[PDB]
Amino acid sequence: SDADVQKQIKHMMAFIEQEANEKAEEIDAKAEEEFNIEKGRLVQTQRLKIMEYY
Amino acid sequence: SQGIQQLLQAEKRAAEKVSEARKRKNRRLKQAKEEAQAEIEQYRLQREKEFKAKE
Amino acid sequence: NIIAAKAAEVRANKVNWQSYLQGQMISAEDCEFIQRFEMKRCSEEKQEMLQTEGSQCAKTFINLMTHISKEQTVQYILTMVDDMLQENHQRVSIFFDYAKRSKSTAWPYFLPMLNRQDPFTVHMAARIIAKLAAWGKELMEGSDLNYYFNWIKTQLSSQSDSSQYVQCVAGCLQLMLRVNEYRFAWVEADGVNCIMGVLSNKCGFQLQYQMIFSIWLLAFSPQMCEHLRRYNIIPVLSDILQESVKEKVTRIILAAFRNFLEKSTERETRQEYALAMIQCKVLKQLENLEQQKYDDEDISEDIKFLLEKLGESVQDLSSFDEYSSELKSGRLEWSPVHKSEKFWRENAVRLNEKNYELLKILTKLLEVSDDPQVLAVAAHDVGEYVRHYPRGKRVIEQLGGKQLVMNHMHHEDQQVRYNALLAVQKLMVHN
Amino acid sequence: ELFRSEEMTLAQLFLQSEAAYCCVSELEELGKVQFRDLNPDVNVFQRKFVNEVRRCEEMDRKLRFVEKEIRKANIPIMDTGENPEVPFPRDMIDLEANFEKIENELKEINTNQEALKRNFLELTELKFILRKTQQFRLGFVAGVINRERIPTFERMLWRVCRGNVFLRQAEIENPLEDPVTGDYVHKSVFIIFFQGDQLKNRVKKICEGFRASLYPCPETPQERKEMASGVNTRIDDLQMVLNQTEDHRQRVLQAAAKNIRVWFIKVRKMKAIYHTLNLCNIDVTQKCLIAEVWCPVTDLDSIQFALRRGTEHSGSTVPSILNRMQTNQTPPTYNKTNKFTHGFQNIVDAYGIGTYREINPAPYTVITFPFLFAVMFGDFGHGILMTLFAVWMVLRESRILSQKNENEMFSMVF
């Protein structure tokens, strides 16, 4: 029936939008690790200069 | 067919969401150098208190 | 899949809160707050309510989940808290503030809901716990962490609604593994060995991605990259690259492989992983992927990264010094150097060094070795030595190696016979 | 009913990428669907499955090479069993590694067999050359030639040298094989003696001129014994390796003579599948394949079953369900046929194809064409002879169907 086709269309539309959220979590979790590393680089760099000064 | 039209609109929204997520998370990565200062100042304050205790 | 459909049925199936107040199961404040949740609908109205009355917000939801045995009601309350936090992760602070006011961690308010009978209810508990624990500044630790991880491992290892509930288990684990403390804490779980089993048992592509995504999270830490070598990750994931069509599965495997070669503590451990990838056909699988185009270029960048790093490993192993080292230690084990055409073409003369030392080793191994693999490798090397340096034929005869390969061409193993036959054929090519 | 062309439906489907391969294969086993091409830009590098088709194209060439070598050796191909398509997982890559294994084994083993056989024959000549030469500042050369060249060879030595050369020809105890043609020829040894380097170059130049095979030899009978022991060692070695070389070649060809039928079916099916998948398209954000087809209305269920079967044989749950279309062009014209009706349809179709649902001329033709032909051709004796031949073709049909397609005249009447 055209209604069962529409249920398949809805399922496929929801599926790619769920995949978008999973890809966004992939981009996010990667970028959080890069963020943690980049924050850590500058923290340890200035923390060494602070330790040397004191 | 309306099915391919609706499917392409969901697939377009999906592509937009991940492209916007890339731009958001790239901008967030640039904030790491500004957010670092909150810990850096605490390490300064910790060494300063220890230094005063040594005096 | 099914949990989202069930959550929508549960949002339609609203309960009469006033009957729980009339039956004395809940307080007037709990009933009045949860009734206002169904009237404060816009983002501002919700935010004003929860931010102004945060202690009562936590108290309401905790009481209504805890004191009610009616499963359909606890499905609804768990759906509303999952939604409330899904709209904004900052809202976890309400439950942590109530836990601090009540002189407790937050976990004991939610952890009892993992013991419910309804599968959707316990997975909705797992979801709200995963949000609370992964986005919260308070850390789940000790008995609470072990209990929730044991719940995850128990449900995950059970692997169509059953498999779709297990996708929700994997999603809960993926949220948790965002936190580095939870990543290291999970290393002690056999759940990684369970994942290797479930992948080896050919589960659906959705679970393949969700499991391998969890492995990719572990692969960000240098220490875990060294420690997790025990699980034989690459053999499994390389078969998944050959078998599964899906770009998501492909991409996350490429990212995991990239993470192992990038993040491992030592060049030797990076090379150990790259060697295992070369052995597990990964270079050839990458070449077939590299020529393709995709809606996401991160696949191509990870392919180029891996092919470069495996290329460096091939060039490193192609050194005559590595060949000499493997021979000196007797490690004749199909290392990529044995079939590097560049190595033999440009260096085969070096085997004559220290009065034929390496050739003496090959002939000694062909005389002494029982292992058909070592014999076959030694024969292969004699054949390639002659192939790229035909002057060596007379030396191999002088060392007795001609007779040894002529014995081994009648060995009980076809792989020995084949390599011995190639070797003896090259020895008889010219005078 | 076959009085008119059968009802056809244009349909569109959304095809799940992992199941897609299995779906197309079930549809090709069903054999009731025609794919609409969605790619006017399709070409060798624009076809979405470049590598998969290219792998199939090369794998077929590898099969052709191996099969020809087996057929040149007259080794019987097994040609047995019925084989399904290769699965959607790229086990075809492990098959390609097996194809390369056989190919490289045959190339290497043939190359080695030829070289070793040549060396063996050359040392066989050298055994006789040494044995004859051992009977004898001077200089000399020695070698072997086909006996028929000796008169011109000897006369040219007596012409290039001004009447001065010592020669002894000696016949071999048996003819010896030519390394290229395999001809066993009655060759003879020769030894030529002279003084000085000037004569050395003349005798050598004439030996090269008649393509005579020269060989080195020691100066004395005593050193010739040591050389003959070396030759015995090398020729015995060559025999031992030739035995296993030929044995291995035989194993490789024998294994391949079984594998080829299976591998041929597998590769040809894969190529057809991937070629069909190249008719589907993917827009700038698209994930599920767009495809469109013509199918008989009676068999929309048969294709929907085939689509479900493809999914059930795959790592996914999506049934890839189709819809009927409304923006319809005129569908391709079809009629079901059997052994009897097929020929009578072909003689209409050869002139023209009806529009959709048009009256079919063929059922009327089944009798009317035989009747008019018989009115033109009517003779009792020819009627018997024609009947006997047609009956023979039917009663031996199972045997006759195996015969060569290249006889187009016989294929027409059959």
From Swiss-Prot, chain A:
GO cellular component labels: apical plasma membrane; clathrin-coated vesicle membrane; cytoplasm; cytosol; endosome; extrinsic component of synaptic vesicle membrane; microvillus; vacuolar proton-transporting V-type ATPase, V1 domain
An example Gene Ontology molecular-function term: proton-transporting ATPase activity, rotational mechanism
Tissue: Expressed in brain (at protein level).
GO biological process terms held by the UniProt record: proton transmembrane transport; synaptic vesicle lumen acidification
UniProt keyword annotation of Protein transport present: no
Location of Phosphotyrosine modifications: Y53
Keyword Transcription regulation attributed: no
Major place of residence: membrane
Subcellular location as annotated: Apical cell membrane; Cytoplasmic vesicle, Secretory vesicle, Synaptic vesicle membrane; Cytoplasmic vesicle, Clathrin-coated vesicle membrane
Key words, A-Z: Acetylation, Cell membrane, Cytoplasmic vesicle, Hydrogen ion transport, Ion transport, Membrane, Phosphoprotein, Synapse, Transport
Subunit structure: V-ATPase is a heteromultimeric enzyme made up of two complexes: the ATP-hydrolytic V1 complex and the proton translocation V0 complex. The V1 complex consists of three catalytic AB heterodimers that form a heterohexamer, three peripheral stalks each consisting of EG heterodimers, one central rotor including subunits D and F, and the regulatory subunits C and H. The proton translocation complex V0 consists of the proton transport subunit a, a ring of proteolipid subunits c9c'', rotary subunit d, subunits e and f, and the accessory subunits ATP6AP1/Ac45 and ATP6AP2/PRR.
UniProt record similarity statement: Belongs to the V-ATPase E subunit family.
Function: Subunit of the V1 complex of vacuolar(H+)-ATPase (V-ATPase), a multisubunit enzyme composed of a peripheral complex (V1) that hydrolyzes ATP and a membrane integral complex (V0) that translocates protons. V-ATPase is responsible for acidifying and maintaining the pH of intracellular compartments and in some cell types, is targeted to the plasma membrane, where it is responsible for acidifying the extracellular environment.
Protein name according to UniProt: V-type proton ATPase subunit E 1
Species per Swiss-Prot/TrEMBL record: Rattus norvegicus (Rat)
Taxonomic lineage of the native organism: Eukaryota, Metazoa, Chordata, Craniata, Vertebrata
Gene: Atp6v1e1
Covered residues, full protein: 4 to 57 of 226
UniProtKB/Swiss-Prot annotation, chain D:
Signal peptide range: none
Subcellular localization: Cytoplasmic vesicle, Clathrin-coated vesicle membrane; Cytoplasmic vesicle, Secretory vesicle, Synaptic vesicle membrane; Melanosome
Cytoplasmic side: 1-358, 397-411
Phosphothreonine: residues bearing it: T220, T330
Residues passing through the membrane, by range: 359-377, 380-396
Ranges of the Vacuolar topological domain: 378-379
Residues with the Phosphotyrosine modification: Y334
Domain of life: Eukaryota
Annotated family: Belongs to the V-ATPase 116 kDa subunit family.
SUBUNIT field: V-ATPase is a heteromultimeric enzyme made up of two complexes: the ATP-hydrolytic V1 complex and the proton translocation V0 complex. The V1 complex consists of three catalytic AB heterodimers that form a heterohexamer, three peripheral stalks each consisting of EG heterodimers, one central rotor including subunits D and F, and the regulatory subunits C and H. The proton translocation complex V0 consists of the proton transport subunit a, a ring of proteolipid subunits c9c'', rotary subunit d, subunits e and f, and the accessory subunits ATP6AP1/Ac45 and ATP6AP2/PRR. Interacts with SPAAR.
Role played: Subunit of the V0 complex of vacuolar(H+)-ATPase (V-ATPase), a multisubunit enzyme composed of a peripheral complex (V1) that hydrolyzes ATP and a membrane integral complex (V0) that translocates protons. V-ATPase is responsible for the acidification of various organelles, such as lysosomes, endosomes, the trans-Golgi network, and secretory granules, including synaptic vesicles. In certain cell types, can be exported to the plasma membrane, where it is involved in the acidification of the extracellular environment. Required for assembly and activity of the vacuolar ATPase.
UniProt protein name: V-type proton ATPase 116 kDa subunit a 1
Protein's organism: Rattus norvegicus (Rat)
Gene assigned in the entry: Atp6v0a1
Span within the parent record: 3 to 444 of 838
